[PDB]
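Inputs:
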Amino acid sequence: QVQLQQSGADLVRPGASVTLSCKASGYTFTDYEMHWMKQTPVHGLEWIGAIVPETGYTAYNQKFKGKAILTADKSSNTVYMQFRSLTSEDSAVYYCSRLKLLGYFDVWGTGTTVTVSSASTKGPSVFPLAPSSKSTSGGTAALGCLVKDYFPEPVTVSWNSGALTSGVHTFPAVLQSSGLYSLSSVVTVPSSSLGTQTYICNVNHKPSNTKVDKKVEPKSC
Amino acid sequence: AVGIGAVF
Amino acid sequence: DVLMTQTPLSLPVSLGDQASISCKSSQSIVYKDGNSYLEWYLQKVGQSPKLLIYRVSNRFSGVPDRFSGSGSGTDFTLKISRVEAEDLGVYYCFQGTHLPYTFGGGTKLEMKRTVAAPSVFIFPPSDEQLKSGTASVVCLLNNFYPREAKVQWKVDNALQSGNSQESVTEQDSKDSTYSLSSTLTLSKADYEKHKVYACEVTHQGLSSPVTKSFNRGEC
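Outputs:
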């Protein structure tokens, strides 16, 4: 049960300074170093630097020396990365990963999306996409959740607190002409068990501290 | 990765 | 620093066939005494990267034997024979000897697959959104191949333009298909002033376009 739990996605003003955390569990903390990666859709993956916590010894990519500061709390088994003056180029997904000497990146964190923006944060509105005669074909019905008008990315969607993953399509969000994002998450289920099963989408928007659970029920007409 | 430390 | 060059940066392969990704390091990446620390990772859309290869030719625990790493000096190669939909994503090579460690640009593995027609469904706006003043009608095109599909909205048979957005999923990791979600956004007034709402789909798997309609005064 080795686990690296990273902090929630952020919206930060240009020139601000944000602190990401990566809490390790299920192994002996001081036996490994924590390395940090940056992922962007244009560049790709970049190694930022590393800290060996037992000691506190850090080393940085020259691209990120000065901006990114790695520290380590040995009690809480946590590693911190600080960005001291955010820029438009700092919007990315930041990863932590564990490593022992002469090893590899075997366990990765879940990633922290940082959006650097001057715009306002808005939580999403969640609407049901109800199964009906117009969404049934061949004994299967489709249903979902419309996650409308949020900023920034990302929104995560689970179904039944993660217990429903088969036949789930959470779509890439689209940019609306207002500058806010919109997203849809659908799932195909048996039509015969629509009366006995419950389908709840769990929508999570960390930048606005929004958590919405929506029970999607069939509506005939 | 080789690593960055001497131990741990 | 040492530059890692992946090629191709996107790699189409038919199902069950072979695929090879070439990764070349600008300098030597042999560690002073032990082998070059050349690692291969795979990432899916919305997931952390996963380790497949370390120490150019060592499969990581649990990785199918269909993945094989090789190379010497500065030339490295990943080989996936019998590619399945579970192998989709971006493969990154990576050197871990000389600071700062570097990755290749990534290589997108994409399945070729038999033709599959889309399942078309339509969802009228919910009353909860209707009370907000807006009305989004959602058309879903589920599990089709290939990715190219045409979606046209029709309100009272009048073809629509400039009021809809659509997105396609990443390729499905179990059946190599794509899904498409298109949303037509009207106001509550505009929605309530028209009655029949239709989503029309053109795709290779269909002999003729498919309309999925509903009437606002339902059933």
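Remarks. Chain A has two domains: 1-118, 119-218. Residues 161 and 202 of chain A are 6 Å apart (CA to CA).
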